[PDB]
Amino acid sequence: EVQLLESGGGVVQPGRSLRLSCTASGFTFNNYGMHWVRQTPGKGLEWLAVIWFDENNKYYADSVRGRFTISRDNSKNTLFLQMNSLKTEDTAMYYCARDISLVRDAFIYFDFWGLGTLVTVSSASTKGPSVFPLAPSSKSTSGGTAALGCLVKDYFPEPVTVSWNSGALTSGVHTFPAVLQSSGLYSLSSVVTVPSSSLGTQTYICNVNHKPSNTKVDKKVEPKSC
Amino acid sequence: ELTLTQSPATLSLSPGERATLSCRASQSVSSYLAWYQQKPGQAPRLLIYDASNRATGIPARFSGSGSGTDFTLTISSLEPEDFAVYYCQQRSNWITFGQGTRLEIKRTVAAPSVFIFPPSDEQLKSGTASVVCLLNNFYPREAKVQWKVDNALQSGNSQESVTEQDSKDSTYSLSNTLTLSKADYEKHKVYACEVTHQGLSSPVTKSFNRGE
């Protein structure tokens, strides 16, 4: 089976360096050109570098030339990307990708992609979230549906996970993509809709886990008097 | 420097229907074009290369055509596993990608249920106030949120994100947070979220009065 397993990703401060690795298996690595390509929500997919059959046969995008170096170690079936002089804007998902490599007379297309690894370039320090209630409205429609949730605020880095009632409550739950605040910390919300008639009786607890800071919080969300 | 523009930005269809996606190059790229599929959380998958050649393991329902500046990806009859984002790529002049076309499941229009949440007493103890507007289970995806505090439009102090299309009901939801200093929050009374959407004949406004 063809595989391209990446590693080396993580949080790095601006101006410092990271080296990404991609270990190939299930094909003859030596016979393929290889590429690095990154992706961000706002700028989309951006090709960065290619290395061909020979180690010295390389090309780069303007955006990374002189800072990033692509290399290969055929003896260990490994592709590398040395990333120097990192900037905030280098934050992205980084993919290693195999070139079709003249199979069927074609080249410079990406015929197999690894799962990718997230690089976060930031000066922020690791920090567990504060968890605040999004309390169900005291004017919830009688015999109708009410919304409640948790605001999981000011954590770094990603990710946090959120469940409701220890996983017992899944129907009607929406956990939103995190947003990066101007502070450099992330914030996320998770909400759920439930029968208004359940508010007086049923307990609703959002379970928040932020592994990077070893933070677990259980937050009970209930109607606010007023 | 050679740019690729994809259209439409979003394509809304049902299983069984034919999908037609377009890619236009700023200048000629001959037949030097490829198409990829990508689902959330997964890596891209090559579909077509050299404009019209189908890649390994790709079902016959996918095909590509075109040359020069105009190209097309066709999916003859949609399967549920086909809803995803589709990208084009050229290798005529270096390497560039299009901005992507979202292929989403069509369903009837549904106006959002709107909810507004005041900041918690707990958060206020910290010096900051977050006010949240939830737009729940709506379709189609496009929606607009406007924040007003005592009728002053707020700009630059809010952020939002949106869920992926729901597996069951094919709707989207959106969460928008307005962030203010505690001092600013305490100086005002009326907090309002105004929502615009295709399913609403006129904009809906949810609001609350601080301390009430």
Binding site: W52, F53, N57, Y59, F107, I108 | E1, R91, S92, W94
Partner: peptide
Amino acid sequence: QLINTNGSWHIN
């Protein structure tokens, strides 16, 4: 050997 000439890719 992959060659890039003014953006155009070729094998030599």
